[PDB]
Amino acid sequence: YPTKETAHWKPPPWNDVDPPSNLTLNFGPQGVLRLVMELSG
Amino acid sequence: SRGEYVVAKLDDLINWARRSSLWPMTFGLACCAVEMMHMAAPRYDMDRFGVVFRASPRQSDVMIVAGTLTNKMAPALRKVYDQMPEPRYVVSMGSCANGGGYYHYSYSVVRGCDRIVPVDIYVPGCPPTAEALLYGILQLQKKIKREKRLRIWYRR
Amino acid sequence: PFFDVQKKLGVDLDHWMTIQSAEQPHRIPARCHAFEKEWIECAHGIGSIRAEKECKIEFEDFRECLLRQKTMKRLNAIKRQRDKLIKEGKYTPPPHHSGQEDLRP
Amino acid sequence: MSLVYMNIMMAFTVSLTGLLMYRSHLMSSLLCLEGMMLSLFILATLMILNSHFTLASMMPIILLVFAACEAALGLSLLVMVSNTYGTDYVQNLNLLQC
Amino acid sequence: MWFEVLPGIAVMGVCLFIPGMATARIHRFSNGGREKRVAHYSYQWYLMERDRRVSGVNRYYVSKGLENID
Amino acid sequence: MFMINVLTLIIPILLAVAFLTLVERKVLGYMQFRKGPNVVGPYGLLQPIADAIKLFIKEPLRPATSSISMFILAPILALTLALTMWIPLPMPYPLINMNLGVLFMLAMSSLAVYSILWSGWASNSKYALIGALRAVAQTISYEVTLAIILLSVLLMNGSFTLSTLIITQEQVWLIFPAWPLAMMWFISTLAETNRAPFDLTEGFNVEYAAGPFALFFMAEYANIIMMNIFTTTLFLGAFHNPYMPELYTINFTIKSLLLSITFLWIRASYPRFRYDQLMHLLWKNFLPLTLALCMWHVSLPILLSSIPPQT
Amino acid sequence: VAAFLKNVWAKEPVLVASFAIAGLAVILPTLSPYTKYSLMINRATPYNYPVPLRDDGNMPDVPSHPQDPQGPSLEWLKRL
Amino acid sequence: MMTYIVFILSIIFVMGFVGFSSKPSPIYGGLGLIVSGGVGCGIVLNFGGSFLGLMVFLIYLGGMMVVFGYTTAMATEQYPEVWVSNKVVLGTFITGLLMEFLMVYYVLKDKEVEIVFKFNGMGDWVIYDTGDSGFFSEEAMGIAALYSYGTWLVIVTGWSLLIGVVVIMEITRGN
Amino acid sequence: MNLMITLLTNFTLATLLVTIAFWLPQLNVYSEKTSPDPMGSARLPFSMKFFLVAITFLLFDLEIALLLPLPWASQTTNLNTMLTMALLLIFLLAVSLAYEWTQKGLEWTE
């Protein structure tokens, strides 16, 4: 029975699964070289 | 008087402790880093003066600008200088850090690191020999020795 | 559902930790070994309904051995009366409760 | 009943009231739950040492080990929640209303 | 040469020698010229408090020998 | 009189940690074909005093702390746990003679990672927090083999008493029946204190000033000297005459100095491990051997009828 | 079963040493003669008081004084 | 004053849970639970439970609360706080902790002594040294009996720990 | 009692050295400095591997907590049962380690 508080409740997905980056470092000058790292763990 | 004597002896104490325990953050910019490495090498051996080898920038006492300061890295130089606790000091090593050197008229070179940071000791040479860099370090220690911090505090 | 497997097969899985009066290591007694032994030997085999009303004296002796509420009540009464008499000035403590008597052994 | 046992029970009920009124985080729930476990350890230990009941002295360690393993399980659950939403917020755990 | 490290090693060795020597001398000073009584167990503590009661001066380390019996 | 004994423990600990910096710089000097400090004092004997007065008047960095309380309680906990690990150490008689001094030291060293974790969260940096989490994971990893090796050795002792460990080794050193436990214990204590080749912090507490960094520094070196003394008592236990305790004190002092200089001589010899390589060293090399030797030192006094006395 | 053993001793000597030490720790307490002496020493260690018995009249195996012949003796422990 | 020390620790223990059951943050929650674990361990150690107190430190605090602080520090994104020079960054900490010990000493007032003095435990509560035990801690031998008497207990405990390892590795996979 | 005095003295010396380390250079009127690292404004990504090694520490630490009364359990009369349960606990710690091995749990921090 759709009441006032229950009207916006959409039904759950059929297979019960729900729709859900990596680190980027800057090794700066702190020879000399800067390193932008897309690291993944 | 008495308090003048006390602040003079405590000035001697803190100046002794600061000059005999200088920890350098060496910018390895260019060829002068090689001669700094020879100044840390066994023959000249900075470590026996209390001058440790490759201290971290957030505890170091003296910044040695050893090599060519270019325009792409001058903000990084001023950033590492601003991250140094006081009393911080700057030793400029070699001609490109002193006044631009062999790349003075270049489009990309800071003409002296004293356009960026306040510089205490200018070490001349291309590169200065490691013995001469060590001379500049000992002249910095003698400059720290004649500081008058608590004397000027007691007189102001 | 109490499937008493330990009595069917004849294994001792957890009876040993159950009561204090069981076989302890190096024959250490509990503080209330006699009182719990008497409550268990009284209330044995007669069921809980008869055990509540027909072994209440041993059970209250064992409960008072555990909690010591009547003993702490009695000591609080005697200590309160002693404090009130020391406060009134009608009583003096003995030397063997004040610490000047060079203890027994 | 006794006094220091009443204090350890008071701590158990205080961490229970903290475990029954959630503010923001699931880690706060796990911390109140393990404060409850700590108070159970303390109270069991004082009873077992009080009566000089010897064989039960292994019991609080047992009461530790299982329940600490239990806490490990709870931490892993929190992590999977924090891998779906980025936070461990209990208000992200409301998809089972329907 | 290599023997130059020996003053610092000697200073550090004296700094490690001082606590053990200190606690041994304090244990002999506070216990009648002897070792401190070790009571890890209830029997050792019971004998120790029995010594404290039989000495008469509230000190366990005063040993009463055969002169205290008739 | 007991407070005198506490001060005569804790002041020479701080003096020994101060001069360990001099011994480290001199021994690492001569091993690197150079000299160490000799300009400041005679042969460098004023270099620790100059370094301490320099670090204690150096400017505080004005730290942008994520918390006040953990920023203050990480050096406090570091120094307190650095000092309280010494009080059950038998030299030949400890400051606090306790029946579970081994377990006490294992507990107080397991509590020593909170200084790392609170220093990490008390910084605003995510990179400093990642480095602190890596350091905490390393330290709690190697605490596993600390506990198992320590248990396996104390299966020959009888109890967790550290003074009983002197009585255990009156006929032979305990490194003879337990040298694999000795070498894995020594590498594990090397990897506890983030000492080289396990020093990936120099490869987390830089949010602090130079003064509080000196506090973490001196707590780390007190842990180094303490674990060397504990390893000396645990494996190379010296002769003890109860009428002359200075024989035992000089003997374990000399052995502790040699083992601390063995740390100084390891750090001037090897490159660093990569992080997963020392996790491989723990979880895949030291832990199977350590578990097998735990089974071995359980079942071996039973088969040789050499079960040590409880008391 | 022998070339595999040489292969695993070449590749992974740590796990071979671990399984060898663990296998010896399992089997060797039963293959030993001195294992029974562990049991005997732990059951002859007097943590409690040896509570005496009332002499009913016929107990030949129970002594009356510690310096009597009958009673459990530890000559084997003193000699070994 | 010194007699009621266990009771004093218990009061602090109760106050310690009010440090974190009000839940200011999970990180300060962990900090309050560590302080509470230390004072409850002091309560345990002052009845002669030395091994159990060292299990509080070694396994509860140094074993498990390390993991709680570790998992908390891998969440709850941080932000800076007040970082003025030393009249704020340490002076407010010292005044706050002095007010905390003021709160500890402040609760021992006339509403407390009606419970303390009518139900005086110290004098007759701590009775663990009632007579002699011998050459052994009774608590140590009771924990030692886990291997001879506790065969089923050790079997189900080690099986639960092995199943704990398996369960954690299955739920923390995502596949 | 002596232990509490020693802990209190160690805590007092620690707090005194921290207080000296904070208040002694704050005598200086050096400079109020401005303008506040490998990330500038990046959030922290979670890493599953660090949590796996933390929970692995906790579970093996519980197994060590079981293994701790062995120097006392060696003194018991039922040595066959004691030896069987000691070897069984260390074998279950080894089985937990082998299951951590073969399911790739010890990888990229091996």
Ligand SMILES: CCCCCCCCCCCCCCCCCC(=O)OC[C@H](COP(=O)([O-])OCC[N+](C)(C)C)OC(=O)CCCCCCCCCCCCCCCCC
């Ligand atoms: C207590 C005082 C000190 C004690 C001694 C320690 C002082 C010496 C220190 C030297 C410097 C150390 C520098 C850092 C070391 C770190 C690197 C390292 O070595 O890692 C460990 C290395 C690691 O080896 P690894 O890293 O080369 O292995 C590679 C592994 N794979 C192939 C998987 C990639 O070795 C060990 O783990 C061995 C530990 C000791 C083993 C002892 C076994 C004893 C014998 C058992 C029986 C064997 C035979 C079988 C049965 C026979 C029966 C009859």
Ligand SMILES: CCCCCCCCCCCCCCCCCC(=O)OC[C@H](COP(=O)(O)OCCN)OC(=O)CCCCCCCCCCCCCCCCC
């Ligand atoms: C357990 C072992 C612990 C050991 C710890 C100590 C290790 C080091 C041992 C001593 C080493 C040598 C110390 C002296 C170094 C040199 C000091 C000196 O004389 O400096 C000269 C300087 C200039 O004076 P000036 O008169 O101008 O000289 C020109 C010549 N006319 O004038 C001055 O500098 C002024 C005078 C300063 C003198 C300071 C001397 C050192 C103080 C050390 C204090 C701690 C000592 C140990 C305490 C605990 C044990 C008692």
Ligand SMILES: CCCCCCCCCCCCCCCCCC(=O)OC[C@H](COP(=O)(O)OCCN)OC(=O)CCCCCCCCCCCCCCCCC
């Ligand atoms: C962030 C806060 C501040 C951080 C820095 C300070 C706190 C952390 C660092 C210090 C840790 C304190 C540890 C205190 C207990 C240590 C364990 C212990 O007491 O073991 C020794 C001993 C057991 O050995 P045993 O020989 O059996 O005893 C005598 C029997 N004849 O047992 C004894 O001798 C018992 C002696 C009496 C009981 C002592 C109780 C101490 C007070 C309560 C705990 C205080 C700390 C609370 C906060 C902890 C936070 C980590």
Ligand SMILES: CCCCCCCCCCCCCCCCCC(=O)OC[C@H](COP(=O)(O)OCCN)OC(=O)CCCCCCCCCCCCCCCCC
């Ligand atoms: C019964 C006694 C008690 C036994 C239980 C207690 C043992 C104590 C040690 C516990 C060790 C726990 C972890 C064991 C995991 C075994 C599986 C394994 O490691 O397989 C992988 C490995 C191949 O190596 P890889 O995958 O490349 O390694 C990564 C780094 N390169 O594969 C291998 O290296 C092969 C490893 C398995 C075969 C080893 C055989 C050793 C035989 C020694 C002599 C006989 C000993 C008697 C007992 C028989 C043991 C099999």
Ligand code: SF4
């Ligand atoms: S001054 Fe000259 S030699 Fe020196 S770093 Fe510059 S370019 Fe190289």
